[PDB]
Swiss-Prot record, chain A:
Organism of origin: Saccharomyces cerevisiae (strain ATCC 204508 / S288c) (Baker's yeast)
High-level lineage: Eukaryota, Fungi, Dikarya, Ascomycota, Saccharomycotina
More details: Present with 1690 molecules/cell in log phase SD medium.
Function text: Acts as a component of the MCM2-7 complex (MCM complex) which is the putative replicative helicase essential for 'once per cell cycle' DNA replication initiation and elongation in eukaryotic cells. The active ATPase sites in the MCM2-7 ring are formed through the interaction surfaces of two neighboring subunits such that a critical structure of a conserved arginine finger motif is provided in trans relative to the ATP-binding site of the Walker A box of the adjacent subunit.
Subunit-level organization: Component of the MCM2-7 complex. The complex forms a toroidal hexameric ring with the proposed subunit order MCM2-MCM6-MCM4-MCM7-MCM3-MCM5; loaded onto DNA, forms a head-head double hexamer.
Subcellular location(s) of the protein: Nucleus
Protein name: DNA replication licensing factor MCM2
Superkingdom as given in the UniProt entry: Eukaryota
Family: Belongs to the MCM family.
Chain's gene name: MCM2
Effect of E173K: In allele MCM2-1
UniProtKB/Swiss-Prot annotation, chain B:
Ranges that cross the membrane: none
Gene that specifies this protein: CDC45
Lineage, uppermost ranks: Eukaryota, Fungi, Dikarya, Ascomycota, Saccharomycotina
Role, per record: Required for initiation of chromosomal DNA replication. Acts at the origin of replication. Also has a role in minichromosome maintenance.
Pfam families: CDC45
Organism: Saccharomyces cerevisiae (strain ATCC 204508 / S288c) (Baker's yeast)
Protein name as it appears in the record: Cell division control protein 45
UniProt-annotated location(s): Nucleus
Amino acid sequence: PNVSRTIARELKSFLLEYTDETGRSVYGARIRTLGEMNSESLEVNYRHLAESKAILALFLAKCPEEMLKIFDLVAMEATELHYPDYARIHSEIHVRISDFPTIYSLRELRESNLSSLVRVTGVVTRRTGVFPQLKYVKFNCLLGPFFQDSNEEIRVNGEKTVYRNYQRVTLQEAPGTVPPGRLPRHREVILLADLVDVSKPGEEVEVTGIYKNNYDGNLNAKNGFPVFATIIEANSIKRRE
Amino acid sequence: ISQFSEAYNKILRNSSSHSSCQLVIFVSCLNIDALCATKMLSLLFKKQLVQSQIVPIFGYSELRRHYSQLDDNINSLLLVGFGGVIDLEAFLEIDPQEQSFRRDIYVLDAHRPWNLDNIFGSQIIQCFDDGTVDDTLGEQKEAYYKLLELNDLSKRKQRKKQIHEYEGVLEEYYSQGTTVVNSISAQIYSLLSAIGETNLSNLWLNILGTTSLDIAYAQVYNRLYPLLQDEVKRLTPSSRNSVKTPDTLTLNIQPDYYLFLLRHSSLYDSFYYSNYVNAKLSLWNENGKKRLHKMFARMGIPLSTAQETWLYMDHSIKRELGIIFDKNLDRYGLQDIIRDGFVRTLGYRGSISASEFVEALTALLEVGNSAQKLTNLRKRWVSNFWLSWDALDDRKVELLNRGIQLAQDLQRAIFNTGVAILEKKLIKHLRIYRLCVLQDGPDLDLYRNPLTLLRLGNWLIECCAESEDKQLLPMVLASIDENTDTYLVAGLTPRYPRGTKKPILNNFSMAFQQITAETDAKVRIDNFESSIIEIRREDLSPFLEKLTLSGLL
């Protein structure tokens, strides 16, 4: 909605002049860090966002999807005023969003978690190699740019298309924390951009990713019912913790 | 003390012959200026096809081995960069032979002040003092015509009082710092333009000469730009390109940078190793290294694009190379980077910055190559001289690049080790002056050459002082590997941050001679330069104590 644009006008205020620990804006120093490192992940603490207002924190537990797209463009605006450049560097920065309890583990998940950002934790299992995803579409003409997708692609040209690395990692629940007489159920995890390669098999990993379904997907043969797949599109990655 | 053209006609009349000629022009020594000078000199001789012998002298003591050994038919001699300080009339002796003396030794030097015995009392010279310090220079003028040849008791007392009266002010002179007025090359070109040769590669030799020393001051060079730029205006390959064209195809003005190896190395490595920038940005520090990356974040230049070789960077960044720097560098205090420089383009090979070429030659001089060992080493440098001499030629570019792949590596050494010093804070502020010694380090083989320690010493005296309050204090360095504790110690001069009021006149020349005249403990002036000497670890410490006091500055 257009009203949500006004929200941006607020969150930018949270993005720069917000201070903590006696002056010295933290998020200003993060933008300065990348910044110099130019690693294109801007990192916003949930603790602080929730500290300023609970209304946005509530938006993170309701509808993270379109709000991150609203938010990171503004982050790009803040980097734009701080470093009048990076029109040539990545032109997108998607925010990492540190710890968000919740702190649902694995095996405890329901429909109520759909479309809403949720923290998960557990051991990594062997990960697929890095296969560039289509993302943005562009050509010399010759229709215009078509974003597809996460993850459908319905309903190919290519000239210069901006690829972004994809990686799918299967996250299994930690063996120590398993309640007796229960098998360690596990979920699919979709990394994107820089989150790629941060993971290694054998390790416990803390992920903030949102939960997703689509699209049946494929069973319809052995289920009996219209049952969707369960795939956590990932947001951040941290060692345990 | 003569017209350059007329000194030329003299060296013409004594020259031709058969079995001609004979003259030995002495190219000396390790200073790139020497090459710059003697190459256009040698080309000038080849023009009239006058046979010549050209000698690569290293040691000042080494010159005696030559001049005392082989001379037979040689009525006209030429020498370069030596004799301005110590006179060769006493050093060689001479012993006048046959007025209208048979042999004329031309001495070309940029060093001041001239030896007193040189200019007055014409025997071996035929001095080159013209025209830089003419001057007067009335202090040397009264030094002789008074001194020579020099009721009666009061006239004797009066006379002697006058003698010491002249001797005091005379003692002020010739005891002084050695400082180059103008690059010998420039004057050889002033001699060359009177004869009428405008040749392009010649002029490039001049540009090379002038830009040999900008690593160390100018000092007058800041006003040498008229005398070069006008000449660049006195010729032109074509009114307009006409791309390229494959021939002429010559040198031109571009916004060049004290930045190091911009064109033949990757950009980031070009800031990170540059000498002026290693200071202002505190690059030895990990905390400052980042500030560079912030520079690149300001430029919008990718880090990955900074890592890539300069030939291959995108075109947009090239066209914006002269703008972006204006937009950004100003904020970091780095605003003095952009010079008006000279760049000669060979076309399809590449282009080369006037300065970078000099970095290639210097690179050639030390690498890419008990008395028996030092003689053999100085010999290796003598051979290496020609490996460096060849790179000046246009027709062989193939080895010039062998210089540049070295010039990079050297810095990668020099910088590295340079940082290895600042981590331990090895600088001794002392009282009167700053001093240092390298007791240990990697690969001292590179540091054997005088000029290597001239550049490390340079990057270090440049690093310690931005400025950086207060009191620019000259620096001292020392290194040892082999040859049984030779511990080479070179004198240095302070660097002003582009705002230079005085020449400041390096005083180590005098301070060393005071010690050679005191206990002379393993002190060796064997190297051609008055600033650089040798020492032994046994006697270095008492030498350092005798260096500390009495301070002449």
